[PDB]
Amino acid sequence: MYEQLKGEWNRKSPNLSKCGEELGRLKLVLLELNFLPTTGTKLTKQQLILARDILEIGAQWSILRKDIPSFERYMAQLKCYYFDYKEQLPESAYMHQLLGLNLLFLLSQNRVAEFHTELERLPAKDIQTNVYIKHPVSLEQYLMEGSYNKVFLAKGNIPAESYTFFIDILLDTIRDEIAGCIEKAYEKILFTEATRILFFNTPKKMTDYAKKRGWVLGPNNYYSFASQQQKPEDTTIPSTELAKQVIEYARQLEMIV
Amino acid sequence: GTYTLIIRLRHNVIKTGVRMISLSYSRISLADIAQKLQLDSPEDAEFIVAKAIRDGVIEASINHEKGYVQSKEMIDIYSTREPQLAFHQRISFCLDI
Amino acid sequence: MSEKKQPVDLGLLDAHVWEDNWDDDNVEDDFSNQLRAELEKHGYKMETS
Amino acid sequence: STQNRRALDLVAAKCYYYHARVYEFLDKLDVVRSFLHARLRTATLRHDADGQATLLNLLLRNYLHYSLYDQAEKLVSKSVFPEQANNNEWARYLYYTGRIKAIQLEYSEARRTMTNALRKAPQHTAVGFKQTVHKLLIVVELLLG
Amino acid sequence: GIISLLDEDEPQLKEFALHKLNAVVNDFWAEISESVDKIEVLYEDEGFRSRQFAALVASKVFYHLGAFEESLNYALGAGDL
Numbered sequence: 023m024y025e026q027l028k029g030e031w032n033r034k035s036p037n038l039s040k041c042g043e044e045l046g047r048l049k050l051v052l053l054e055l056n057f058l059p060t061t062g063t064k065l066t067k068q069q070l071i072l073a074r075d076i077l078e079i080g081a082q083w084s085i086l087r088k089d090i091p092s093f094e095r096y097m098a099q100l101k102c103y104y105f106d107y108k109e110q111l112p113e114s115a116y117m118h119q120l121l122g123l124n125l126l127f128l129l130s131q132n133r134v135a136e137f138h139t140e141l142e143r144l145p146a147k148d149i150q151t152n153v154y155i156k157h158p159v160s161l162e163q164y165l166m167e168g169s170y171n172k173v174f175l176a177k178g179n180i181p182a183e184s185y186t187f188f189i190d191i192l193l194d195t196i197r198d199e200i201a202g203c204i205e206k207a208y209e210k211i212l213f214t215e216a217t218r219i220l221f222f223n224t225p226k227k228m229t230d231y232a233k234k235r236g237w238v239l240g241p242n243n244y245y246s247f248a249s250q251q252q253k254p255e256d257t258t259i260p261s262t263e264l265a266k267q268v269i270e271y272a273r274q275l276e277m278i279v
Numbered sequence: 280g281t282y283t284l285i286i287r288l289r290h291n292v293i294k295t296g297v298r299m300i301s302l303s304y305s306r307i308s309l310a311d312i313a314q315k316l317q318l319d320s321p322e323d324a325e326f327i328v329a330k331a332i333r334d335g336v337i338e339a340s341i342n343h344e345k346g347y348v349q350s351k352e353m354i355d356i357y358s359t360r361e362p363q364l365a366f367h368q369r370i371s372f373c374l375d376i
Numbered sequence: 377m378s379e380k381k382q383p384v385d386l387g388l389l390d391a392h393v394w395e396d397n398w399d400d401d402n403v404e405d406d407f408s409n410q411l412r413a414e415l416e417k418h419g420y421k422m423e424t425s
Numbered sequence: 426s427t428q429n430r431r432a433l434d435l436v437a438a439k440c441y442y443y444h445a446r447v448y449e450f451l452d453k454l455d456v457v458r459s460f461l462h463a464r465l466r467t468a469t470l471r472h473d474a475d476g477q478a479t480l481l482n483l484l485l486r487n488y489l490h491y492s493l494y495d496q497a498e499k500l501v502s503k504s505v506f507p508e509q510a511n512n513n514e515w516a517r518y519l520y521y522t523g524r525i526k527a528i529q530l531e532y533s534e535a536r537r538t539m540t541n542a543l544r545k546a547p548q549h550t551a552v553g554f555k556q557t558v559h560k561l562l563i564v565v566e567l568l569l570g
Numbered sequence: 571g572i573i574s575l576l577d578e579d580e581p582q583l584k585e586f587a588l589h590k591l592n593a594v595v596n597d598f599w600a601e602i603s604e605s606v607d608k609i610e611v612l613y614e615d616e617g618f619r620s621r622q623f624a625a626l627v628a629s630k631v632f633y634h635l636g637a638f639e640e641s642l643n644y645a646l647g648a649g650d651l
Contacts, residue, residue, distance in 0.1 A: 380547060
């Protein structure tokens with residue numbers, strides 16, 4: 023059924039002459055009929071199971087090439103096909119792994135709102151099944167409070183693969199959160215502590231932070247401006263707008279209603 | 280139809296504990312916050328307290344070298360302009376009625 | 377006027393006639409179940425030191 | 426339009442409610458929601474009162490019966506029309522927006538809006554949704570500290 | 571969602587995607603709203619085809635949003651369709 027697929031799907035195609043074939047096949051599956059459901063031809067499952075297989079394998083080999091902007095296309099379309107249902111058999115090799123991977127990606131962009139709004143679509147597999155799904159929510163739970171040592175040490179235990187392109191940027195956004203937290207007006211920190219608090223012994227990446235953000239480290243002092251008092255004694259702005267206000271009170275008080 | 284909200288509650292448990300502590304004292308060492316919260320490590324107590332400060336749970340600051348946490352006190356809200364605003368809104372409503 | 381028609385439903389349907397006038401919920405919560413023997417709480421504290 | 430004053434003043438407003446209830450009672454909800462979208466659209470143009478209150482509540486109701494996105498609608502909704510309401514529909518509209526705010530990790534301002542929701546219910550004996558809103562209020566206030 | 575198809579290059583692909591959206595817009599407008607700028611990118615630019623369809627779908631979504639001047643401008647732009 024217009025397959026032309028069984029060549030280098032299982033075997034790895036490290037940027038082989040493949041993306042052209044994916045483009046061809048997606049054009050063709052567009053041509054054949056409904057690439058997105060319009061409702062009909064229910065018994066016709068081959069154009070459906072084929073479609074979901076194509077999309078999932080494309081995303082699986084897309085994470086390898088690190089197309090973060092494109093990756094969302096495939097993941098969204100897989101989400102579309104996981105809910106028309108009809109009578110299609112749901113189970114695949116994935117339908118768990120792909121959701122756990124989507125979950126990690128969504129967390130690493132540091133947008134936990136939609137992360138939490140997506141937990142409202144799988145009602146009984148959360149704390150019971152699919153270790154692929156128990157690991158990410160466990161990670162978010164640990165990130166909810168300040169305990170981070172376990173998060174760093176959890177790298178030894180990974181569900182399926184390296185997942186590197188999703189956990190490395192997670193460690194970087196942890197960098198960001200810690201930096202955004204350790205602010206507020208505190209005292210001098212010597213050139214050892216804030217370096218050894220996170221990970222790095224004494225490289226220039228701490229220097230990159232220093233010359234990237236503020237805290238001029240002159241007399242060993244890292245200082246962040248966390249006073250921002252401003253607003254002095256400024257009766258004049260009242261003296262205008264309050265006069266406007268009172269004139270209005272007296273306006274709509276004696277005029278005939 | 281409300282199970283998922285309460286499934287995440289333990290962390291806000293520890294948050295409530297530290298908030299009541301914040302309201303109790305003013306100047307307190309970290310050598311006791313974790314000790315009386317059953318938290319064994321005093322390194323992560325820094326982190327949980329700092330986050331609690333970030334989102335506005337408690338108003339204190341931290342002296343990382345010294346080891347004490349003190350909370351600022353801001354008073355005399357009568358002298359500011361905000362009560363005038365709170366009253367003006369109600370004046371408008373009553374005239375509307 | 378007071379229609380109160382409701383798709384939401386009643387839901388459900390004592391040995392507690394001890395109404396202590398009002399509240400005590402915070403009060404009973406304060407000494408939930410411990411620190412009971414206040415006499416002993418003092419006495420076995422003055423001999424401690 | 427000719428008898429729109431009377432026809433939409435009531436009768437229609439309650440009709441939509443009962444017709445929706447039927448479907449919920451022992452049926453599906455979907456083409457109902459398509460019909461509701463269409464009927465909301467035909468309002469908001471000729472008329473702007475109670476045709477934008479009952480429909481808003483019903484539509485958000487069936488969205489919440491499942492667990493969809495549920496937010497991208499409120500932002501452009503224009504809010505339940507003020508200036509007129511039965512003060513009843515304001516109550517459940519507030520309850521709905523309160524819930525959809527609480528589930529999306531926005532706690533602090535959920536309690537105030539849903540408490541405002543609760544204070545608008547009548548003195549009537551029915552404890553149908555008063556139990557519900559109280560239960561949700563307790564659980565959101567165990568958050569924070 | 572399907573709107574993501576507007577990002578990939580293929581003119582035939584995009585001319586399928588937006589050609590189908592105008593069927594479901596009649597109630598997905600609240601979702602579609604957050605991308606009308608991107609749709610408008612493919613209008614009043616000659617590097618596209620059946621561009622009047624883009625104009626039409628713009629007038630649809632703006633009509634639902636009640637920004638009636640936008641709708642009228644894009645209806646004059648779409649013309650005969």
